[PDB]
Write a protein that binds this ligand. Structure first.
Ligand SMILES: Cn1c(=O)cc(CP(=O)(O)O)c2cc(F)c(N3CCCC3)cc21
Length: 269
């Protein structure tokens, strides 16, 4: 509204310096006030689906109790590049919950693919997001192919506004049962990969859970987070980037700066 107008110039200058596109949607869950910048444009999800993948695994777990406990066996073939946890448990296998934790907190690529299989593949995760009223989200492909981040390709994309709206439902709304909800929040709170992104703009005395995504091409990287400032309502926000050239580099500093501007535009500072 009027807060989106305030931050337009600062965002324009930030993305001009970055040399690509920044997408931001930030919601004050108390006032319902919002900051938007390219909030309805598609950006590649990269690893950021792994968070919604974990919440879909949890949603299913509310039907079939013992799902989270189920051991999963896998071979060397499952181990696609950046599977830092699953590669340690190849000879033993892991449970669904451990794969979910690995996928959210270490962004583990084998773990994601193994969990995708369990839900009916990318169409299965998409089906879950449709069920919580997200008509924007689409996953099409698997790790690593979903990372192509091809300009104008809608495959494996969502919008910052849909990402924030869906995150609010799954972390703070009624989309999950309270146990699965608090479990989702706790995997996000325990994320190890986001220290240089939204977390870098969040004071140390505020709770935060996040999931990162990094495609490795087209300056395409992102983060979404729930943030619990002290003595005010939680903030939910999504910060997505991409860039026009394949060889363009992503910037964690740009994501952190975009998060600062979002929080500043909401006046939470
Ligand atoms: C370059 N780079 C990172 O910096 C961080 C991450 C972790 P996250 O931010 O995604 O959660 C990362 C993940 C990949 F799968 C990745 N591949 C590069 C080729 C295809 C994907 C690079 C990554």
């Amino acid at each position: 509204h009027m807060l989106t107008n305030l931050v337009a110039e600062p965002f324009a200058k930030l993305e001009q310096d970055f040399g690509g596109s920044i997408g931001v949607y930030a919601m004050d869950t108390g006032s319902g006030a919002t900051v938007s910048y390219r909030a309805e444009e598609r950006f590649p999800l990269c690893s950021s689906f792994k968070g919604f993948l974990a919440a879909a695994v949890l949603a299913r777990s509310q039907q079939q109790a013992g799902l989270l406990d189920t051991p999963i066996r896998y071979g060397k073939n499952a181990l696609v590049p950046w599977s830092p946890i699953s590669e340690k448990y190849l000879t033993t296998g892991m449970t669904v919950a451990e794969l979910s934790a690995a996928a959210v907190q270490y962004s583990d690529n084998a773990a994601a693919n193994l969990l995708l299989k369990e839900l009916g593949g990318p169409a299965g995760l998409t089906a879950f997001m449709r069920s919580i009223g997200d008509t924007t989200f689409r996953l099409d492909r698997w790790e690593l192919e979903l990372n192509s981040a091809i300009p104008g390709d809608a495959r494996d994309t969502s919008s910052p506004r849909a990402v924030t709206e869906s995150l609010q439902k799954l972390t703070l709304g009624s989309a999950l049962a309270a146990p699965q909800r608090q479990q989702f929040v706790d995997w996000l709170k325990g994320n190890t990969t986001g220290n240089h992104r939204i977390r870098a703009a969040v004071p140390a005395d505020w709770a935060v859970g996040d999931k990162t995504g990094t495609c490795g091409v087209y300056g395409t990287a992102n983060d979404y987070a729930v943030v619990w400032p002290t003595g005010r309502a939680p903030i939910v926000l999504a910060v997505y980037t991409r860039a026009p050239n394949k060889d363009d580099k992503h910037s964690e500093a740009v994501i952190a700066a975009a998060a600062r501007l979002a929080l500043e535009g909401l006046g939470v500072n």
